[PDB]
Design a protein around this ligand. Structure first.
Ligand SMILES: CCCCCCC(=O)CCCCCC/C=C/C[C@@H](O)[C@H](O)[C@](CO)(NCc1c(COP(=O)(O)O)cnc(C)c1O)C(=O)O
Lengths: 423, 492, 49
């Protein structure tokens, strides 16, 4: 309908917005932390040597000499790069050996390996769940689960954190809707996506009631254990070994090898029936290069170390209990987590209105502690992208390496700094 | 749109008879798949495919049968060609662990023997940097001994490391852009950095044959997606005009931003993008450009800078320059280069920066060593000879293939060489026959290609000498005569 | 050399009609059906003559 001259005038008058908006906020995240040398116990941060209370290295296998020797041997035999996807001449013997080792360690029929920690649980969910299904996810799920759910088009319902009456209420509403429309009902699939040990809050999900609800209301459970894979249970199998729940009941278990095993990549274990689908319908699996053999050999040697010595879980548990009990009593802060949790949070007891001021106070505490030679970090989130934004918090991570004296001194340092600042 | 040097490409159309035969074969396979499914339904034959547990039989079926129909009756028959395990460095010659199956590829049993010295065409290693010996291996070993394997925190937290700073600065110097940032995986790079740039109320013009990572990244953001024809600048111009004039669909409000996603070299198709025309259109219509150089970072260019140096254009014209280290540099990872403000915003607001683990130290060391080898800062003359040898190998191989009479796709300078098979059974037959004659090849089917177009891909390298190419060409000619794969009418 | 010739012709048959991917009993079923149809058409044509 438009004349031509009007069309060129419309085209020339248009002015797009800049590709990236200006950032006149002086973000603390803009100023990174420069770590000189490996991020291990007694590291150097910003030119100041400090004890590492921030890195996710629970079992202290990052600097174990055996792991380095095994990785060096694999590097000599194969080289750094794999140069191909898993389908096209990218599968080595080390990959199959690692899959077998994981399957035997978790006492599960099959396991699959993803080359990047985020991608495993970012791609597991869309593979099984399609448009039209209903998925019940916990509120405090990590960002990876949220992106996985968004990638699929399935409807999403968020139930309250560790509240089983809320989940039963949602399931009852779903069943009445099911009775309303049976023809749609026969097709829709129900999933319950839950995290083993929550990163954001540092609590533990009540698995037995989840199993009861699954068997009563016919919903398939997807369990994510990024932290609980290598820290919980007598033999470090996971939360399933901690509670005593039979591993058969859980349909799929996802994890990342970066936290405990100290190697890049993730994995997913389950029955062959559910696992075999991911080898074809997993975007992160089919369309990406395989994991380098060096990292796979490092992970295998870490698995051998974990199998040989099961007392490291006990000492880690006792250190977590010790530090968590010691931290109780700070005047201006509150501990958010459970005793068994390796990594937990410290949050302001009474928060000022502006989030930026609270972040500034926490950053001041962190810097003042770093001057005292205890390295701490702050939980980092995306304010806009996060569906449920947790309050700002200082992350505390416990490691088998840290001695009792270091834990006591860190507790006293944080206590003095908090009383100095929050006053 | 000015081209310094002639731009030649050929995409020969499929014969009619071959298309008819392809449809007949696919129909026969589909019908027999129906018959097998019906037989398995009545339990006349045990279903080797696993079934869900007994107490979960009351649950809704996890898999719709017809959804997996292609996997159950089509893919499973010739599964042996893909997922071939190897046990050596993926250089010019690779070792493959032999395997055989008794239940028609349902389950694989590894036999003792291993095939040695197979000529390799599947692995990329364009510049031949995948070796277990050299200066790169020694530097990687030293960094592994010092830093250790893997890091245990995200970049914004304590997981940041000085090696990452050195790698980012080196990448920024290498490309020519002001700043750059590195990432664990190129797929992650796309899927985690497309949503950051564009939001709801923006348009994304995606090429018809874009990578899966780009499509996923576009879907994750709320931007509207419209697809233009592959390397058809008239289609792109029409879409740009209509989008600028009419505006948003529901309410005719002007678009906030218009982003065009293009790739350097399309892996399957094998065609180099018409960059000068794209840049001309982008400047005329005030759009933004996202250039994926995964397959062209090292292969193309007088000194291997990329497609931008191949066309002689200015690096500052491209707004976003993504690349992947895996294809050429011999290490996994990804990177994005651009102006300083873009990199600062990405450092602050990227998903990978916040919720993902950093890149491994030995990998970044090997990348740094490879880049300093190519750039000539090493002091060795090996930087230029690798690129020259790759160019000669590509030209010789493509000319020899075309002289025989196979149908070949893509630009002549493109190192990736797709050869056309066009039929279902020939996909398996070509792979098996080539493997028997001691050459390893890769064949691709319906999941990644159209149903009619089924192709076998070759990825040339600077590692290959002339004699390897000669033996490969002789065996390919013999197999083509055996299976009648010469369809080209122009020159045979 | 004729035997190799007919073997090659049968091999081209198998490649063209996608019988190469199928199991032997499926091949036998398909061949029986095809020859039955061909014979039916032959007799129906002889009806016309
Ligand atoms: C009749 C029955 C026929 C049955 C056939 C079944 C069949 O073909 C199944 C195929 C099995 C495996 C499929 C693999 C697909 C590969 C596509 C390829 O383009 C890849 O995407 C690659 C390598 O992964 N892409 C690399 C790349 C990335 C990511 O790089 P990394 O982060 O290093 O992994 C991102 N963008 C782009 C453009 C590329 O190329 C590739 O190009 O080879």
């Amino acid at each position: 309908d438009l004349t031509v001259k009007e069309k060129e005038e419309l085209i020339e008058e248009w002015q797009p917005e800049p590709l990236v908006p200006p950032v006149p906020k002086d973000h603390p995240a803009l100023n990174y932390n420069i770590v000189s040398g490996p991020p291990s116990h007694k590291t150097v941060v910003n030119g100041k040597e400090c004890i590492n209370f921030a890195s996710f290295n629970f079992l202290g296998l990052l600097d174990n000499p055996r792991v380095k020797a095994a990785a060096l041997a694999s590097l000599k035999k194969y080289g750094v790069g794999t140069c191909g996807p898993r389908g096209f001449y990218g599968t080595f013997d080390v990959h199959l050996d690692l899959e077998d080792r994981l399957a035997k360690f978790m006492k599960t029929e099959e396991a699959i390996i993803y080359s990047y920690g985020f991608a495993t649980i970012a791609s597991a969910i869309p593979a099984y769940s399609k448009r039209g299904d209903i998925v019940f996810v916990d509120r405090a799920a990590c960002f990876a689960i949220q992106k996985g759910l968004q990638a699929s088009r399935s409807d999403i319902k968020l139930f309250k954190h560790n509240d089983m009456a809320d989940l039963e209420r949602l399931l009852k509403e779903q069943e009445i809707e099911d009775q309303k429309n049976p023809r749609k009902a026969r097709v829709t699939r129900r999933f319950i996506v839950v995290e083993g040990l929550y990163m954001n809050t540092g609590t533990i999900c009540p698995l037995p009631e989840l199993v009861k609800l699954k068997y009563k209301y016919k919903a398939r459970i997807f369990l994510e254990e990024s932290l609980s894979f290598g820290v919980l249970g007598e033999h470090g199998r996971g939360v399933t070994e901690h509670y005593g729940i039979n591993i058969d009941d859980i349909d799929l278990i996802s994890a990342n090898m970066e936290n405990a095993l100290a190697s890049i990549g993730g994995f997913c274990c389950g029955r062959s029936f559910v696992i075999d689908h991911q080898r074809l319908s997993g975007q992160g699996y089919c369309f990406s290069a395989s994991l380098p053999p060096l990292l796979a050999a490092a992970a295998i040697e870490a698995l051998n170390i974990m199998e040989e010595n099961p007392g490291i879980f006990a000492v880690l548990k006792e250190k977590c209990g010790q530090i968590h009990k010691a931290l109780q009593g700070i005047s201006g802060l509150k501990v958010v987590g459970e005793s068994l949790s390796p990594a937990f949070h410290l949050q302001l007891e009474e928060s000022t209105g502006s989030r930026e001021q609270d972040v500034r106070l926490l950053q001041e505490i962190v810097d003042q502690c770093m001057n005292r030679s205890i390295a701490l970090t702050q939980a980092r989130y995306l304010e806009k992208e996060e569906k449920c934004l947790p309050p700002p918090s200082i992350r505390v991570v416990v490691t088998v390496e840290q001695t009792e004296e270091e834990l006591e001194r860190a507790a006293s340092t944080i206590k003095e700094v908090a009383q100095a600042v929050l006053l | 749109g000015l081209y310094k040097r002639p731009f030649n490409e050929a995409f020969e159309e499929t014969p009619m008879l071959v298309a008819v035969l392809t449809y007949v074969g696919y129909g026969v396979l589909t019908l027999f798949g129906y018959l097998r499914d019906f037989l398995r339904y009545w339990r006349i034959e045990k279903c080797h495919h696993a079934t869900e547990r007994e107490e979960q039989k009351d649950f809704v079926s996890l898999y719709q049968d017809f959804e997996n129909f292609y996997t159950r009756n089509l893919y499973m028959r010739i599964r042996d060609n893909w997922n071939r395990p190897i046990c050596s460095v993926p250089g010019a010659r690779v070792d493959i662990m032999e395997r055989q199956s008794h239940d028609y590829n349902w389950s694989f049993k590894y036999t003792g023997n291993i095939i040695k010295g197979v000529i390799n065409m599947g692995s990329y290693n364009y510049l031949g940097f995948a070796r277990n010996t050299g200066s790169c291996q020694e530097a990687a070993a030293k960094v592994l001994e010092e830093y250790g394997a893997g890091v245990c925190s995200t970049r914004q937290e304590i997981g940041n490391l000085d090696k990452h700073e050195e790698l980012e600065e080196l990448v920024a110097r290498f490309l020519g852009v002001e700043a750059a940032m590195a990432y664990g995986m190129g797929f992650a790079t796309n899927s985690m950095n497309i949503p950051a740039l564009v939001g709801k109320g923006c348009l994304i013009l995606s090429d018809e044959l874009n990578h899966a990572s780009l499509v996923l990244g576009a879907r994750l953001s709320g931007a509207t997606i419209r697809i233009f024809k592959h390397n058809n600048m008239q289609s792109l111009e029409k879409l740009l005009k209509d989008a600028i004039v009419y505006g948003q669909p529901r309410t005719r409000r002007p678009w906030k931003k218009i982003l065009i996603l293009v790739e350097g070299i399309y892996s399957m198709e094998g065609s180099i993008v018409r960059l000068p025309e794209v840049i001309a259109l982008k400047k005329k219509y005030k759009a933004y450009l996202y250039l994926d150089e995964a397959h062209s970072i090292g292969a193309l260019g007088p000194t291997g800078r990329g497609v931008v140096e191949y066309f002689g254009l200015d690096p500052e014209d491209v707004d976003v320059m993504m690349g992947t280290f895996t294809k050429s540099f011999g290490a996994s990872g990804g990177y994005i280069g651009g102006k300083k403000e873009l990199i600062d915003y990405l450092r602050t607001h990227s998903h990978s920066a916040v919720y993902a683990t950093s890149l491994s130290p030995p990998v970044v060391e090997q990348i740094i060593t490879s880049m300093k080898c190519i750039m000539g800062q090493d002091g060795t003359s090996l930087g230029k000879e690798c690129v020259q040898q790759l160019a000669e190998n590509t030209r010789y191989f493509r000319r020899r293939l075309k002289e025989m009479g196979f149908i070949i796709y893509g630009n002549e300078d493109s190192p990736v060489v797709p050869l056309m098979l066009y039929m279902p059974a020939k996909i398996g037959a070509f792979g098996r026959e080539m493997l028997k004659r001691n050459i390893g090849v890769v064949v691709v089917g319906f999941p990644a290609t159209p149903i009619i177009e089924s192709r076998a891909r070759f990825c040339l390298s600077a590692a290959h000498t002339k004699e390897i190419l000669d033996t490969a060409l002789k065996e390919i000619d013999e197999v083509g005569d055996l299976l009648q794969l010469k369809y080209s009418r122009h020159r045979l | 050399r004729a035997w190799k010739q007919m073997s090659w012709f049968y091999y081209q048959y198998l490649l063209v009609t996608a019988l190469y991917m199928l199991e032997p009993w499926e091949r036998t079923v398909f061949n029986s059906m095809l020859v039955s149809i061909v014979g039916m058409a032959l007799y129906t044509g002889y009806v016309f003559m």
